[PDB]
Each structure stands twice: as C-alpha cells, then as structure tokens.
C-alpha cells in the first residue's frame, strides 16, 4: 500500500535532481549517497534542517523518465571515501531510497510545478524545488517499490 509512503511525504520538501548519465544514478542507488554542485548543496543543507523529510526526485537527462526518489538522511559531508562519479562537487549527502523504480514523463504530464512557472514537473534545472502538492502527487505516481521497507525510513525521522 501507500499509507507509510504518504506518512513519509507529509510536509516534506522536494527537489528535482537532473543527472547527465545513468552511471551516477546507479551509483547513488547502490551506495546511498548523492553529491551536487555547491549552489544546490547549500539549498539542500538549508532544506534538511527545515523539514521533516527532504525528498530528491531523480531524472537522467534525455531518458524521458524519472528513475526514483530518495530521502536525505544527513547534511553534506567532506573527506569520505571518494565516489567515482562520471562528471568542483560539494560534499556527499547520505540518502535512503524510497523508490528505485522508473516513471515515464508521459505519466506525469498532468503535474505542473508552481515554483517553475507551472511548467510540467519533468522540466527543471538540477536542484529545482518542487512545490509540496506537486511533489507529493509525483512521488505517488511511481510504481511502489516492494523491495524497500519504509518502516526503516520512518525510524530516522
């Protein structure tokens, strides 16, 4: 079901992450981390302290889909085991995946983001914040990922 998911998404903040390649998203999925440019790092750190959940929604450029979404579990940190991104980067955020399944853009055509001029939510620069109701509904469109137990994620928050 979707009830724990809705609980996790309650009063969350949402950010679009655009990746130039699948290899980086695959790495993020395996390793539970993300790194972004300083401008977005600052926004994410601010958002992590401000909200019960901060959700990253991932899209690989030119793929025509979202590849999943994850919750920030920490602020960014520096000096750790170097991640071999296929690329100046900020620190590393730990993340917990909520959904590692794909969603085609064809399925989110009805969702517009008030924070990017009410353009379809698929449209946006890396780090674009997604407004609460748009973001919530977007996460709810994804196929449920039955490999993830959200109890574990709830126990952080």
UniProtKB/Swiss-Prot annotation:
Mutagenesis or variant effect for residue 85 to A: Abolishes binding to N6-methyladenosine (m6A)-containing RNAs. Abolishes binding to m6A-containing mRNAs
UniProt subcellular location: Nucleus; Nucleus speckle
Effect the entry attributes to changing residue 24 to D: Abolished binding to N6-methyladenosine (m6A)-containing RNAs
Entry-annotated residues carrying Phosphoserine: 81
Phenotype when changing residue 37 to T: Reduced binding to N6-methyladenosine (m6A)-containing RNAs
Record note on modification: Tyrosine phosphorylated.
Outcome of swapping residue 85 to D: Does not affect ability to influence alternative splice site selection
Consequence the record notes for mutating residue 126 to K: Does not affect ability to influence alternative splice site selection
Phenotypic consequence of residue 125 to D: Does not affect ability to influence alternative splice site selection
Positions with a binding annotation for RNA: 18-20, 34-35, 85, 126
Domain YTH: 12-142
Effect listed in the UniProt record for changing residue 58 to D: Does not affect ability to influence alternative splice site selection
Domain of life: Eukaryota
Domain free text: The YTH domain mediates RNA-binding.
Described function: Regulator of alternative splicing that specifically recognizes and binds N6-methyladenosine (m6A)-containing RNAs. M6A is a modification present at internal sites of mRNAs and some non-coding RNAs and plays a role in the efficiency of mRNA splicing, processing and stability. Acts as a key regulator of exon-inclusion or exon-skipping during alternative splicing via interaction with mRNA splicing factors SRSF3 and SRSF10.
Assembly and binders: Interacts with SRSF1. Interacts with SRSF2. Interacts with SRSF3. Interacts with SRSF7. Interacts with SRSF10. Interacts with CPSF6. Interacts with KHDRBS1/SAM68. Interacts with TRA2B. Interacts with KHDRBS3. Interacts with EMD. Interacts with RBMX. Interacts with ZCCHC8.
Protein name, entry field: YTH domain-containing protein 1
Organism placement in taxonomy: Eukaryota, Metazoa, Chordata, Craniata, Vertebrata
Gene: YTHDC1
């Amino acid at each position: 079901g979707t009830s724990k998911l809705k609980y996790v998404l309650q009063d969350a903040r949402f950010f679009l992450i655009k990746s130039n390649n699948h290899e980086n998203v695959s790495l993020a999925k395996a390793k539970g981390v993300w790194s972004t440019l300083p401008v977005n790092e600052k926004k994410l750190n601010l958002a992590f302290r401000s909200a019960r959940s901060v959700i990253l929604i991932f899209s690989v450029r030119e793929s025509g889909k979202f590849q999943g979404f994850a919750r920030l579990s920490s602020e960014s940190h520096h000096g750790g085991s170097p991640i071999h991104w296929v690329l100046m980067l900020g620190g590393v955020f730990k993340i917990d995946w909520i959904c590692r399944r794909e969603l085609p853009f064809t399925k989110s055509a009805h969702l517009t983001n008030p924070w990017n001029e009410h353009k379809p939510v698929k449209i946006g620069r890396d780090g674009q914040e997604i407004e609460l109701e748009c973001g919530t509904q977007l996460c709810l469109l994804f196929p449920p990922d039955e490999s993830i137990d959200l109890y574990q994620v709830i126990h952080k928050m």
